[PDB]
Structure formats: C-alpha cells, structure tokens
Amino acid sequence: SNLIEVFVDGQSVMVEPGTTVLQACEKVGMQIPRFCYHERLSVAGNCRMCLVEIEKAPKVVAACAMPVMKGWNILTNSEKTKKAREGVMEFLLANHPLDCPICDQGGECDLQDQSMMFGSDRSRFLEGKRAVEDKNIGPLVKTIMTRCIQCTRCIRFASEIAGVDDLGTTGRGNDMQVGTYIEKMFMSELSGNIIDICPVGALTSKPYAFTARPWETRKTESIDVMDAVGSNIVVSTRTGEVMRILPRMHEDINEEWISDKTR
Amino acid sequence: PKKTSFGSLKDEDRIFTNLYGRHDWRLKGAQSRGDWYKTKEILLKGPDWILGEVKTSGLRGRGGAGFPTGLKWSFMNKPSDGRPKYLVVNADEGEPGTCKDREIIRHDPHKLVEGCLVGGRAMGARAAYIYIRGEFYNEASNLQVAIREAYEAGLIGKNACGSGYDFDVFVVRGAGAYICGEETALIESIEGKQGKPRLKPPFPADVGVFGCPTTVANVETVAVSPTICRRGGAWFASFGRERNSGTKLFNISGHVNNPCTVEEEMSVPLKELIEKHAGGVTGGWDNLLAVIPGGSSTPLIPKSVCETVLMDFDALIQAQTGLGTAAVIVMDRSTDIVKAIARLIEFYKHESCGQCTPCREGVDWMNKVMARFVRGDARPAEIDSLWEISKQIEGHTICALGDGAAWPVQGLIRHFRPELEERMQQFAQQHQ
Amino acid sequence: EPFDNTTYKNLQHHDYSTYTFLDLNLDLSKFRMPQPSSGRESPRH
Amino acid sequence: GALFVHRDTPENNPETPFDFTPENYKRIEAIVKNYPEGHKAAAVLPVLDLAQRQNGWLPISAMNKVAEILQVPPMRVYEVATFYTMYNRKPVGKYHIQVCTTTPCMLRNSDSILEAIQKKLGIKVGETTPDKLFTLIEVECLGACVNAPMVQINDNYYEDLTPKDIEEIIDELKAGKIPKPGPRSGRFSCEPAGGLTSLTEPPKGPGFGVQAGL
Ligand SMILES: Cc1cc2nc3c(=O)[nH]c(=O)nc-3n(C[C@H](O)[C@H](O)[C@H](O)COP(=O)(O)O)c2cc1C
Ligand code: SF4
Ligand code: SF4
Ligand code: SF4
Numbered sequence: 015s016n017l018i019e020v021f022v023d024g025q026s027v028m029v030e031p032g033t034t035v036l037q038a039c040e041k042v043g044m045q046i047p048r049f050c051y052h053e054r055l056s057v058a059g060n061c062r063m064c065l066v067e068i069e070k071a072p073k074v075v076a077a078c079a080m081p082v083m084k085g086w087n088i089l090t091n092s093e094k095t096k097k098a099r100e101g102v103m104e105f106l107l108a109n110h111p112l113d114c115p116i117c118d119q120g121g122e123c124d125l126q127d128q129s130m131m132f133g134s135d136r137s138r139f140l141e142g143k144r145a146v147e148d149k150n151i152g153p154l155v156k157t158i159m160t161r162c163i164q165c166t167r168c169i170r171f172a173s174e175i176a177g178v179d180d181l182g183t184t185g186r187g188n189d190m191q192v193g194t195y196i197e198k199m200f201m202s203e204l205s206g207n208i209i210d211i212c213p214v215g216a217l218t219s220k221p222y223a224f225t226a227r228p229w230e231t232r233k234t235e236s237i238d239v240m241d242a243v244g245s246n247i248v249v250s251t252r253t254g255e256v257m258r259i260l261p262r263m264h265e266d267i268n269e270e271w272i273s274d275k276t277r
Numbered sequence: 278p279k280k281t282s283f284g285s286l287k288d289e290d291r292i293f294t295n296l297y298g299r300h301d302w303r304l305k306g307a308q309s310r311g312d313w314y315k316t317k318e319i320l321l322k323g324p325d326w327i328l329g330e331v332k333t334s335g336l337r338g339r340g341g342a343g344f345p346t347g348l349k350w351s352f353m354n355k356p357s358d359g360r361p362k363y364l365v366v367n368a369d370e371g372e373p374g375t376c377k378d379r380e381i382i383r384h385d386p387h388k389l390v391e392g393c394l395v396g397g398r399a400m401g402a403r404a405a406y407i408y409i410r411g412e413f414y415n416e417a418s419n420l421q422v423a424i425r426e427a428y429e430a431g432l433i434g435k436n437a438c439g440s441g442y443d444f445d446v447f448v449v450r451g452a453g454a455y456i457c458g459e460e461t462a463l464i465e466s467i468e469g470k471q472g473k474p475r476l477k478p479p480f481p482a483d484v485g486v487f488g489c490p491t492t493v494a495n496v497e498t499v500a501v502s503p504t505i506c507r508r509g510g511a512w513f514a515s516f517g518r519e520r521n522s523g524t525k526l527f528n529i530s531g532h533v534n535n536p537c538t539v540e541e542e543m544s545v546p547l548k549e550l551i552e553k554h555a556g557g558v559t560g561g562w563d564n565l566l567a568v569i570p571g572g573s574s575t576p577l578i579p580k581s582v583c584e585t586v587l588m589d590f591d592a593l594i595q596a597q598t599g600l601g602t603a604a605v606i607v608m609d610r611s612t613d614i615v616k617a618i619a620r621l622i623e624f625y626k627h628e629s630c631g632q633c634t635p636c637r638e639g640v641d642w643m644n645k646v647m648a649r650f651v652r653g654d655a656r657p658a659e660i661d662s663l664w665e666i667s668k669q670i671e672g673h674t675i676c677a678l679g680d681g682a683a684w685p686v687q688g689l690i691r692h693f694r695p696e697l698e699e700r701m702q703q704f705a706q707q708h709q
Numbered sequence: 710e711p712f713d714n715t716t717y718k719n720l721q722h723h724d725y726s727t728y729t730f731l732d733l734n735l736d737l738s739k740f741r742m743p744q745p746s747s748g749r750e751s752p753r754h
Numbered sequence: 755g756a757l758f759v760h761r762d763t764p765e766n767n768p769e770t771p772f773d774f775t776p777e778n779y780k781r782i783e784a785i786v787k788n789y790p791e792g793h794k795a796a797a798v799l800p801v802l803d804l805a806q807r808q809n810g811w812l813p814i815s816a817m818n819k820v821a822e823i824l825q826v827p828p829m830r831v832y833e834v835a836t837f838y839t840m841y842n843r844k845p846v847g848k849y850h851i852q853v854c855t856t857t858p859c860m861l862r863n864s865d866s867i868l869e870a871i872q873k874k875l876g877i878k879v880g881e882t883t884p885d886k887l888f889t890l891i892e893v894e895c896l897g898a899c900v901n902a903p904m905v906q907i908n909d910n911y912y913e914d915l916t917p918k919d920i921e922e923i924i925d926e927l928k929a930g931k932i933p934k935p936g937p938r939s940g941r942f943s944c945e946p947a948g949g950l951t952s953l954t955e956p957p958k959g960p961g962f963g964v965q966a967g968l
C-alpha cells in the first residue's frame with residue numbers, strides 16, 4: 015500500500031514510510047552496531063556508531079535517526095562503513111579506563127563485544143586518560159563514571175520512562191559529566207532499570223557487586239510475585255544460589271523493565 | 278560580456294556605508310543613506326518577487342558554508358500548516374579572526390532590521406529572533422534602540438511600512454558558546470536548552486525553533502537583502518565571478534601593518550586585498566609565511582599560493598581551503614606556525630559541546646598530540662596518525678565543528694610537514 | 710550638517726549600564742503582537 | 755577550578771538567600787513574553803543572566819529560583835549554567851578581566867597584555883585579588899580580532915591595547931573612574947589605522963540605484 019522499497023546490501027525490503035535505515039536492516043536480519051540507540055527511548059544520534067554508507071552517497075548517515083528513502087541501497091559491510099565503526103570505537107576507548115577485570119560489566123558489555131566484532135585489535139593512543147569523580151545516586155546503583163561513554167540513555171530513561179528529570183549533563187566537551195550536579199538520589203520505583211540500559215559498567219548494581227560473572231550464571235525464566243502485574247523475569251543462579259533478578263521482555267506486560275522491589 | 282579582473286569597488290557600489298561608524302547609526306541618518314526606502318513597495322510586490330531577485334543575485338551565505346541563499350530561503354515558501362514561521366538571524370560571530378558582524382550590528386543596525394522584514398516577508402515569517410553573542414552587550418543595546426525606533430515609527434510592528442504585514446523583531450543574547458553559532462544549536466539555545474546541535478533531518482525549514490518552520494541566516498546575508506531588492510540582483514551579480522557573485526566584508530588580521538575591516542568585490546585577489554587596504558604584510562610580501570583565509574575553520578595556504586589566489590568560494594576550494602567567513606589571518610616568517618595552529622585546536626577543544634564522540638574525544642586527542650608536536654616530543658610517524666585521526670573526525674560528526682578542527686590540522690600537515698619533522702629531530706638530539 | 714567623516718558618532722554606548730538591555734526590552738513590550746500558543750501550558754502538561 | 759559538581763558550602767547552599775528584586779520581576783515578565791505560550795523554558799538563559807547581574811554570580815539558590823518561576827526542572831537549569839561560560843558559579847570580583855589569547859590576538863602579542871596585568875595586580879591567571887576587585891581569566895575570540903590585542907572588563911571592550919595602556923585602564927578602575935571603552939590607539943573602530951581606504955566619499959542619498967519598478 016504505502017510501503018516503500020529499499021535495498022539492504024542489494025536485497026529488497028518493503029518498509030513503512032518513516033522507517034529508519036536501522037529498522038530496515040533488522041528486517042533482513044542485520045543488527046547495526048549501537049551504543050546510544052534504544053528502541054524504547056528517544057533517538058539521540060550521539061554515539062555515531064550506527065554510521066552506515068548509502069551507495070552513491072558521499073557521507074555516512076546515522077542509521078538510528080535517518081529515515082529510509084525510496085531506492086536507497088544500504089551498505090552495511092562496505093569498507094567505508096567498516097572504517098567508520100573502527101574510528102568511532104577508537105575514540106570511545108581512548109579515555110576508557112582499564113577496568114574490565116574489576117568491572118562487573120565484563121562478559122556482558124557491549125563496548126567489549128562491539129570492539130571485538132567492529133573494532134581494531136590495538137591502540138594508537140599514546141596520551142593520558144580522563145578521570146572523573148564518582149557520584150552517589152543511592153544505595154541501589156553504583157557509579158563508576160569514568161567508564162561512562164556519554165550515551166545519555168540514563169538521562170532519557172529517567173525523563174521519558176520514569177518521569178524524573180534529575181539526570182543530566184554538566185559541562186561541555188571531554189569534561190562533560192553525566193550526573194545530578196547536586197548530591198541527589200535517583201530513587202524511584204523504576205530506578206534500577208538504568209543499570210540495564212547503561213551499556214557499560216558506569217552504572218551497576220550495588221547488591222550484586224563482585225558476586226559473580228555473566229558466563230558462570232544459569233538463566234531461569236520465571237515470574238515476579240512482588241506485585242500482580244506478573245512481570246516476566248530471569249533468575250540468574252550459580253551453584254544453587256540466586257545471584258540477581260533480570261527483566262525478561264514481554265511486550266504486553268513489563269516491556270523490558272522491572273520494579274526495584276522485583277529487582 | 279566578461280570581467281576578467283575583480284576588485285576596486287567604488288564607494289557608491291558599497292552596501293555598508295557606515296561600516297566605520299563615521300555617520301549617525303540612528304534612524305534619521307540611516308534614512309538619509311537609503312535604508313527603509315520604498316520598503317512598502319518591496320513587501321507588496323510579493324514573496325516570489327523577493328526570492329526571485331535574491332536567487333538572481335547569486336547571493337551565498339556569508340556565515341561559512343556559502344550555500345545559495347535564494348534556494349535556501351525558498352524552502353520556507355509553502356502553505357502554512359497551522360504552526361507559526363520564524364526567521365532567526367545569526368549574530369553569534371564566534372569564528373576566530375572574524376569580526377564583520379559586529380560592525381553591521383552596531384554601526385548599521387537598521388539594515389539588519391529591514392532585512393529581517395524583507396527576508397521574513399519572503400519566508401512568510403511572523404517574527405524574527407536575532408541571536409547575538411552575550412559579550413556583544415553594547416552592540417546588542419544599540420540594536421534594541423534601533424528596533425524601538427522602528428517600532429515607534431511604524432517600520433516594524435502591526436501593519437509594518439503600511440504593507441498589512443505584522444512582523445516583530447526580538448533580540449536574544451547568548452551566554453558564551455561558539456557552538457551556538459551552528460544553526461540547530463542556536464535554535465536549541467533559544468528554546469532554553471544546552472547549545473548542542475541537532476541531527477538533520479529534520480531540516481530547520483520543517484522543524485525548527487519551537488518545532489516550527491524556521492530559517493537561520495547570517496547578519497551580512499540579511500543586511501544586503503533590502504539593497505538587493507531596491508538596486509536589483511543583477512547589480513549584485515554585476516560584481517564577482519559567476520556563481521561567486523556579490524560584495525563581501527573582509528577582516529584582515531594578524532601580522533599586517535593596518536589590520537582592518539573592509540568591503541571589496543568578491544573574487545578580489547588576496548594579495549591586492551592585503552597590500553591595498555591593510556598596508557601589506559609586516560616586513561613585506563617576502564616575509565609572509567602562510568594565510569588563513571576564512572577563519573580558524575579553514576585550511577591555511579602558504580605564500581606560494583597566496584600570490585595568485587582569488588578570494589571567492591570556488592577558487593579557494595581549488596586551493597584546498599575555503600572562504601568561510603572571509604576572515605584573513607596573516608602570519609609572518611617570525612611566527613611559530615605550529616604553535617598558532619595548536620592554539621586553534623585548543624580553541625575547538627574548549628568549544629565542543631561534547632554531544633558526539635568523534636569531537637568529544639578526537640579534538641582532545643588532536644590537542645594533546647599537537648601540544649607534543651610543538652615541543653617535538655613525538656616521532657615522525659605520529660604525523661600520519663594525526664592525519665587519520667583527523668579524517669575519522671571529518672564526516673562522522675553531527676555538526677561541522679569537528680570538520681572545522683580537522684581541516685586546520687590537515688592544512689599544516691599538507692604544507693608544513695618538514696617543519697614538524699625538523700622540530701621532532703631537534704628534540705631527539707637534545708635528549709641525548 | 711556639512712559632510713564630516715572625521716568623528717565617531719557611536720558614543721552612546723559609553724553610557725550604557727548593567728540593566729540597559731533588559732530595560733529596553735521592557736519598553737518594547739507594548740509594541741509587540743499577540744504571541745502564538747501551542748495549546749498547553751508546557752510540554753510537561 | 756573547572757568543577758562541574760556542586761558541594762554545599764556555608765556560603766553556597768540551597769538555603770543561601772536570593773530572590774529577584776521587584777524591579778527585576780517586571781523585567782522577567784517582558785523576557786517570558788517574547789516567546790510563544792507553552793515554551794517558557796526559552797527564558798532560562800536571559801533570566802539566568804538577570805540573576806547574575808543582580809547578585810554578581812549564580813549560587814545554587816539562584817538557579818532553583820529561576821526554575822521555580824519558569825516551572826522548569828531544576829537540573830535543566832543546572833545544565834544551562836554549566837554549559838555556558840558567562841555564568842559565574844563561583845564569586846568573582848567587582849571587575850572581571852577577560853583576555854583573548856586565541857591565535858589572531860596571540861599573533862599580536864596578547865601575552866604581553868596578560869603578563870602586564872599579572873605584574874600589576876599581583877595575581878596569576880584564574881585567581882582573585884585579595885580585595886575582590888579584579889579577577890583574571892583567559893578567554894577565546896571575543897569578536898574584536900582586527901582590534902587586537904583586546905580585553906573585556908565586565909561588559910566593555912578595551913581594544914588595540916599596549917602593555918602601558920592596560921595598566922592605565924586598571925589604574926582608573928582602582929581609583930573609581932570607569933575608563934572609556936574602545937580602541938586605545940589612534941583610531942575609533944575597525945577602520946584602517948593610518949587612514950580610511952574606503953567610504954571616503956559622501957554617502958549616497960535615498961533613491962540612489964533603485965531599479966525600474968521596485
Ligand atoms: C561551530 C560553528 C559555528 C558557527 N558560527 C556561525 C556564526 O557565528 N555566524 C554565522 O552566521 N554562522 C555560523 N555558523 C554557520 C551556521 O551553522 C549556518 O550555516 C549559517 O549561520 C547559515 O547562515 P547563512 O545561510 O546566511 O550563511 C557556524 C557553524 C558552525 C558549525
Ligand atoms: S564498561 Fe566494558 S569495556 Fe569498560 S571496563 Fe567495564 S567491561 Fe571493560
Ligand atoms: S552513565 Fe551509562 S547510560 Fe548514562 S550516559 Fe553514561 S554510558 Fe550512557
Ligand atoms: S562535532 Fe563536537 S560540537 Fe559538533 S555536535 Fe559533535 S561534540 Fe558537539
């Protein structure tokens with residue numbers, strides 16, 4: 015009907031008008047790299063990791079924000095696309111702390127995984143690194159903000175999901191710091207969910223700190239009983255012990271969020 | 278048929294006739310010089326007539342990009358959806374080396390006010406927001422006085438100039454950010470948010486300030502619009518090369534005998550401009566090292582190119598640089614070229630918004646390297662690394678500030694590489 | 710009135726003060742026009 | 755020292771007294787009326803600058819008040835203050851000396867200006883004088899590149915300076931007089947120093963050059 019026709023690496027896909035390059039690539043099974051885009055949050059276009067080449071076009075476009083146009087051929091595995099990803103990852107890791115062994119996000123980090131798949135194998139950064147202060151936003155979320163990649167997912171979640179506008183950016187440039195400026199607690203019935211969306215170890219669970227690693231946990235899909243919503247969850251168990259509760263996506267109930275009590 | 282020589286603009290063909298502040302800047306004086314004249318007839322002729330004349334003039338934006346203005350202003354010429362429509366005038370004037378817009382605002386304010394109306398009528402706008410940098414307090418106050426004078430005299434307001442068109446002109450002051458000169462960042466600063474640019478699409482003509490159709494224009498671009506309409510576009514096209522038509526305010530700064538602001542015909546030879554108005558280079562043309570033609574965000578050119586380069590959009594592109602704001606910075610052979618360029622990178626470091634990764638981290642990374650290049654604490658193989666770092670910041674950023682911090686570094690590596698290597702090896706001998 | 714090009718006529722700014730710019734905007738309020746309305750007191754409404 | 759986090763102090767705390775004066779509320783009402791209904795947040799910057807002009811700096815209470823009157827989340831006001839460099843989140847002197855050190859002003863020996871002020875006021879860049887009259891900082895291009903070297907003190911530009919002149923400007927400020935803004939060389943603005951090379955002929959009167967119909 016109103017569907018338009020676009021090509022992803024030459025294969026035709028029919029997409030509704032308003033669809034993004036990103037969403038089009040999904041319908042052929044390709045996942046564009048991402049750090050800032052989240053399907054349930056507002057588009058930001060700041061990480062620049064989604065950049066993808068359009069054939070017969072000289073500039074790479076941010077797939078997360080650019081609508082598809084009829085006739086576009088999206089080159090997800092081109093040299094220009096692959097070189098853009100390597101450059102962005104190089105900037106992301108330049109000031110990133112060498113904390114993977116001491117970082118609870120190890121083994122389930124998108125920066126680690128997307129560096130391995132879409133990044134280089136070595137560094138050419140011969141300078142010093144940035145260091146940031148740590149910010150206390152309550153007893154449930156641990157902040158090691160030197161690991162932040164400034165994706166603003168936490169800022170958007172609090173404003174657009176929790177309805178709390180307490181997280182923001184202070185400063186500009188390399189010194190831009192996510193936080194509350196003042197000493198404040200991000201206490202809410204949905205506070206813990208910023209831990210999941212944060213793709214790095216900047217925001218982590220204090221109760222779960224240091225107890226386990228992702229690979230050694232068995233995943234059990236159960237249900238939450240703290241309330242009557244029946245939120246679908248995953249129970250991570252190691253050696254006959256319960257280590258953490260994670261959300262399991264159910265569109266018609268909890269989407270991909272759970273309450274702090276459940277968590 | 279053809280003009281193969283350009284320059285020597287006669288004062289009667291100049292547009293900014295009080296550029297130096299030697300006449301009255303209030304309404305009475307400006308009306309003598311020709312402002313606010315038959316403006317009722319311009320407005321009644323219609324939006325299509327105003328846009329058509331601006332298209333014929335070949336006018337291009339003086340803010341930096343140089344996009345054809347008439348085509349840009351015609352995006353807004355469309356039926357209303359219910360939302361208002363606004364004209365935004367960019368007086369942020371943040372580009373280092375550039376000071377043209379300060380004079381227009383403070384010595385010829387009423388040209389700007391009249392341009393808002395004529396530009397606004399063409400676009401269909403209901404008002405104009407003139408965004409002026411916060412350090413231009415005295416200049417901002419002068420504009421408000423002028424706007425009050427026009428409001429009291431019926432030139433702007435309800436039924437302005439007796440044309441049946443309602444137009445209001447507001448002035449909003451920034452608080453200290455070069456990045457607010459970027460058209461989308463400027464919009465967001467007016468809306469009350471951090472001066473961080475937007476992604477395009479959406480384009481400002483569809484979604485702009487307050488989520489309404491908007492067009493962002495430079496002070497010089499707007500100020501010349503009334504004059505183009507009275508005297509005619511062909512007059513404005515009579516000057517300059519084809520597709521580089523018009524007259525341009527130039528700012529000559531640096532190691533010159535008489536640094537100055539001056540209006541000259543587009544495509545004027547660069548050597549003529551410096552020698553004629555500015556008094557030449559300190560120590561003469563043979564002491565010239567390099568020139569930055571269009572402000573910090575433009576690659577430098579060495580003396581070998583400065584001899585025979587015309588100051589227009591196209592010619593400076595073929596030299597691997599850009600006209601930009603037409604702000605000329607001149608460095609002599611006594612200059613430490615690397616230290617000069619490094620300080621510009623240090624400026625882009627302090628002005629990046631931090632929104633997007635390649636400039637938030639890359640510009641810092643380039644700054645740190647260039648600082649070492651100054652002391653020589655680097656190996657010759659880091660020069661080519663800096664080039665690739667620059668090319669990873671170019672085309673991968675939201676705005677053009679990153680594009681504007683890579684091109685300067687690319688210019689130094691392109692034309693002054695031997696200077697970089699010579700400093701490195703000297704530091705190696707000293708550390709023996 | 711005779712043409713004199715040897716004086717700087719923009720000398721008013723030597724007297725401006727801290728509150729000048731905002732005072733003039735206050736005096737300019739009466740001359741404006743009715744602003745347009747989105748339809749809600751704020752985006753948070 | 756370039757900190758973008760707030761730690762409560764005896765002088766700066768959410769209960770530190772600050773409210774606009776009755777005159778400044780009327781000024782606010784004009785500021786808020788310049789923008790469409792439903793977008794009062796657009797007034798954050800101008801209203802914030804108003805608070806700093808009344809008080810001299812922006813304490814944490816000042817930011818909160820701006821948010822309360824505009825019904826804006828307090829954090830969003832904190833973001834604006836930190837992003838923009840004209841907002842003083844620490845107390846500054848009665849006179850705020852700003853020196854442009856960018857390349858065009860650096861090529862014309864703006865460093866000499868910076869060294870002269872340091873010697874006379876007995877302070878290093880970024881520090882405040884013991885008497886709290888003067889505060890020195892380096893800044894970027896201030897829009898007066900042809901008139902370099904230049905400094906801004908409060909809201910006035912003093913241009914085409916020389917090490918002697920900037921000491922004079924300080925001396926006048928110390929005594930009580932407020933010096934005269936503008937180039938301190940034998941010229942008035944951006945005009946070619948030695949003499950005008952353009953706009954020497956009388957300006958052309960109205961109706962000159964008008965096209966056929968118009
Ligand atoms: C970092 C940055 C700073 C800019 N500063 C200015 C400025 O101070 N004045 C200006 O007119 N344009 C500036 N621009 C260009 C604007 O983004 C925009 O292209 C221009 O204002 C459009 O006006 P025009 O069509 O009349 O040229 C800047 C752009 C960037 C990326
Ligand atoms: S966030 Fe990821 S890349 Fe960074 S230290 Fe933690 S595990 Fe390593
Ligand atoms: S703390 Fe995490 S979610 Fe928030 S901006 Fe930083 S990386 Fe993104
Ligand atoms: S390139 Fe720099 S200034 Fe432009 S949006 Fe990205 S971080 Fe901000």
Ligand code: FES
Pocket residue numbers: 047048049050051058059060061062063064065076077078079
């Ligand atoms: S996923 Fe598109 S810029 Fe981050």
Ligand code: FES
Pocket residue numbers: 373374375854855856857858859860894895896897898899902904
């Ligand atoms: S470089 Fe100093 S005012 Fe522009």
Ligand SMILES: [K+]
Pocket residue numbers: 119208209210211212213214215216217218
């Ligand atoms: K996390």
